Structure formats: structure tokens, C-alpha cells
From Swiss-Prot:
Disulfide bonds: none annotated. The chain holds residues 28 to 206 of 411 of the full protein. GO terms for cellular component: nuclear body; nucleolus; nucleoplasm; nucleus; snRNA-activating protein complex. Residues 36-47 are annotated as: Disordered. The lineage of its organism: Eukaryota, Metazoa, Chordata, Craniata, Vertebrata. Belongs to the SNAPC3/SRD2 family. Part of the SNAPc complex required for the transcription of both RNA polymerase II and III small-nuclear RNA genes. Binds to the proximal sequence element (PSE), a non-TATA-box basal promoter element common to these 2 types of genes. Recruits TBP and BRF2 to the U6 snRNA TATA box. It is found in: Nucleus. This is snRNA-activating protein complex subunit 3. One of its GO terms (biological process) is transcription by RNA polymerase III. It comes from Homo sapiens.
Length: 159
DNA sequence: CCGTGTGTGTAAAGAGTGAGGCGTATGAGGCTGTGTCGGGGCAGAGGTACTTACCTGGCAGGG
């Protein structure tokens, strides 16, 4: 069913997860990203033909769309708003801490986040199929420290 | 040249107060009634200069 909200940013109405996955899979059949294959002059012609077919334009139109819409390092200058605050934070930290080395608690949550993403199965027979509906549940750690009533710790699992 | 002895980041506890919203409880209002008791008037004992008049002390005689 629909994931329709129940509250503005805290809840939604109870919905069947299977029907939700089915709706997503149906509305993405044959025109969806459900391939799960990593990215790789002859192919340019095929791409132009596909663009022409999908957008109802000529081959020359597809070629010029491809050409014009083409894709278009630390120090900065010529500031903007957010680049301004970034540069200021960086210079402040420069007059600040002498050991730039990344904190051991940021690296922890980072590595836990990217522990095993982008690691394909070595069997390739149990690999999940398309539309497998990952639910990112987070289990609340039990209250085993006083500080765990205040800010409720939790561990996230990709069920 | 590899031991070790001290520093440092930065969010993680550890308290340490403090704050805010919400939900339940309370109240106030006539109403009407009935026992009662402090109460609150209620009056009540009960305790500036000059002049004239009057009083006092004294010494005097009298008997």
C-alpha cells in the first residue's frame, strides 16, 4: 500500500510491506534500475538511437543532446556562502589542532557504514534478486548505562 | 634503532541543574438543603507688657 504519513515527520500509517515492494517493482518493470550490474564509439550510436526512441527526437537531436549534456582539489577561492563557512571552519581548525588525524570515533561509524557495501557475493547463486526490499531497521540498545536513558543508543541492521 | 614516557581529539559518559509542554486535577458558579461552630459586629462596663488682686511672712502691740 501507500507509505502515506500519519504524522508530519515521525510516523506513517500501517501498510503492508509486501504490497509496497510489489508496487515499486511493478512501476519499475522494464524501465527500472533493477539490473544490479556495475557500470562498464559503436555504443554511441545505440545510445543516440535509444534517446531518439524515448524522447521522440531525431538522431541528430540525440547526438547534440548527448554532446551538450556532457559532464561539466582541496584549496578553494572565489567564495560562496557555504564555501565561505567551510573555508572559515578549515582555517579555524588550522590555527587549532596540531594533529589533523581523523578522530577514532568518526572512523568507527564510517567503517561500520562502509564495512561491506560494494562487496559482491563470491557464490553468485545466492545473490539477491531485483526488488528485494531492504528494510533498514535500527534496534535500540538496552539500558545498560545511565547515559542510555538520555540518548538512546541503537545499532542499525539492513534486514 | 628500538624501547618507553608523556600529550592530544573528540565525541562519550557523568553529573548537574533546568526547562517546557501536557495532561490530569481543581475551581467557580447558582441551586437546594441541613447540623454546627466560629465569627463578627454589637454597644457596654470599668478603669508680649502693664496693671490689679490675693496669699504669705514678719514684726508689731496688746491682753
Amino acid at each position: 500500500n501507500f507509505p502515506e504519513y500519519e504524522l508530519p515527520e515521525l510516523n506513517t500509517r500501517a501498510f503492508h510491506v509486501g504490497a509496497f515492494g510489489e508496487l515499486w517493482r511493478g512501476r519499475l518493470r522494464g524501465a527500472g534500475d533493477l539490473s544490479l550490474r556495475e557500470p562498464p564509439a559503436a555504443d554511441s550510436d545505440r545510445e543516440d538511437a535509444a534517446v531518439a526512441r524515448d524522447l521522440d527526437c531525431s538522431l541528430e537531436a540525440a547526438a547534440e543532446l548527448r554532446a551538450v549534456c556532457g559532464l561539466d582539489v582541496i584549496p578553494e577561492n572565489t567564495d560562496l556562502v557555504t564555501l565561505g563557512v567551510r573555508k572559515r571552519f578549515l582555517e579555524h581548525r588550522e590555527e587549532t589542532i596540531t594533529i589533523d588525524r581523523a578522530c577514532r570515533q568518526e572512523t568507527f561509524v564510517y567503517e561500520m557504514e562502509s564495512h561491506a557495501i560494494g562487496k559482491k557475493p563470491e557464490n553468485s547463486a545466492d545473490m539477491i534478486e531485483e526488488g528485494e526490499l531492504i528494510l533498514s531497521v535500527n534496534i535500540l540498545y538496552p539500558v545498560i548505562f545511565h547515559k542510555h536513558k538520555e540518548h538512546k543508543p541503537y545499532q542499525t541492521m539492513l534486514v
